[PDB]
Amino acid sequence: KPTKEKLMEQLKGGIIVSCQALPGEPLYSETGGIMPLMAKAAQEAGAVGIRANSVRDIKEIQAITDLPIIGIIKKDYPPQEPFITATMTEVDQLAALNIAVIAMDCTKRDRHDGLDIASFIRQVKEKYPNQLLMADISTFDEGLVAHQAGIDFVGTTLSGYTPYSRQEAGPDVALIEALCKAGIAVIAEGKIHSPEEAKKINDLGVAGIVVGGAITRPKEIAERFIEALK
């Protein structure tokens, strides 16, 4: 449980690496053991944090690194859309892992539990006052709503992954900058594919930067190489 100040010191000017592989992906292992190696690679490279999904993966990663973890549990709650740490059940399991940050879908979309997002954020903060939280959002207003509700960090991971957000390819640098200017602790995340993009984003004065697929999804990296040849 690092203080926000201490965590901000740790994350500033560095790269957080998202080490995820869902069933169906080439690096998904039913018995685990792959994502911890990815996290180890990130640590050896000089990464300042890890983003990880699932109780299993988080625990395996904790076993090999002391880097702070942003943790999520991806689980569908149909008919509603959110799946990144969608209900208190996922929050509770993540709280039990003793990790630095819990990230969760904080979009404006209808929630399975019927709560408005601000109410849920307040509920989590009331239940776990000592837990730092990150709001995965898609739009500027969603970031503002989450911040006013008491979220510690606002992340841009869902921009381009909701129908009403920016659909264009590449990182949502306009959203990142706008949130930074508004005086919000921003963790830039989503579609950051090149070191050049990462530097541009870092220059905006973000609290942190998460790079995922560009480091830890060889399939997606290879696809981009292959596409350039067409």
Find the angle CA(79)-CA(170)-CA(223) to the nearest 5 degrees. 85
Find the angle CA(90)-CA(219)-CA(107) to the nearest 5 degrees. 35
**DSSP secondary structure code for residue 121 in this structure:** H
Check if the beta carbon of residue 109 is closer than 8 Å to that of residue 162: yes
Select from 58, 62, 53, 49 the least CA-distant residue to 15. Answer: 49
Range of the domain at 83: 1-230
| Separation CA 85–CA 94 (nearest Å) | 9
Burial of 105 (0-12, 13-18, 19+ CB in 10 A): buried
Phi and psi torsions of 65, nearest 5°: -145, 150
What is the DSSP secondary-structure string of 160-224? TSSTTS--SSS--HHHHHHHHHTT--EEEES---SHHHHHHHHTTT-SEEEE-HHHH-HHHHHHH
Helix (H) or strand (E) holding 6: helix 4-11
Residues paired with 101 in a beta bridge: 70, 132
- State this model's resolution in angstroms: 1.6
Tell me the CB-side half-sphere exposure of residue 139, using CA atoms within 13 A: 12
Look at the block and give the residue holding tokens 């509770």: 92
Helix axes 173-181, 140-148, angle to 10 degrees: 40
Experimental method: X-ray
Length of the chain: 230
Find the angle CA(33)-CA(187)-CA(173) to the nearest 5 degrees. 115
Find the angle CA(196)-CA(197)-CA(201) to the nearest 5 degrees. 120
| Separation CA 118–CA 195 (nearest Å) | 34
Check if the beta carbon of residue 121 is closer than 8 Å to that of residue 88: no
Look at the block and give the residue holding tokens 């939280």: 133
Q: How far lies 207's CA from each of 4, 123, 149, 197, in Å?
A: 11, 25, 19, 16
**Residue 125: helix, strand or coil by DSSP?**
helix
Check if the beta carbon of residue 211 is closer than 8 Å to that of residue 18: yes
Find the angle CA(214)-CA(220)-CA(225) to the nearest 5 degrees. 90
Question: Count of domains in the chain?
Answer: 1
Burial of 156 (0-12, 13-18, 19+ CB in 10 A): buried
Find the angle CA(113)-CA(57)-CA(49) to the nearest 5 degrees. 95
**Residue 46: helix, strand or coil by DSSP?**
coil
The beta-strand segments (E) located in the chain are 16-18, 49-53, 69-72, 101-105, 132-136, 153-155, 186-189, 208-211
The CATH number of whichever domain residue 175 belongs to comes to: 3.20.20.70
Select from 39, 13, 38 the least CA-distant residue to 202. Answer: 13
Look at the block and give the residue holding tokens 């220059």: 203
Break positions in the chain: residue before each gap, C to N over 2.5 angstroms: none
Look at the block and give the residue holding tokens 């879908």: 105
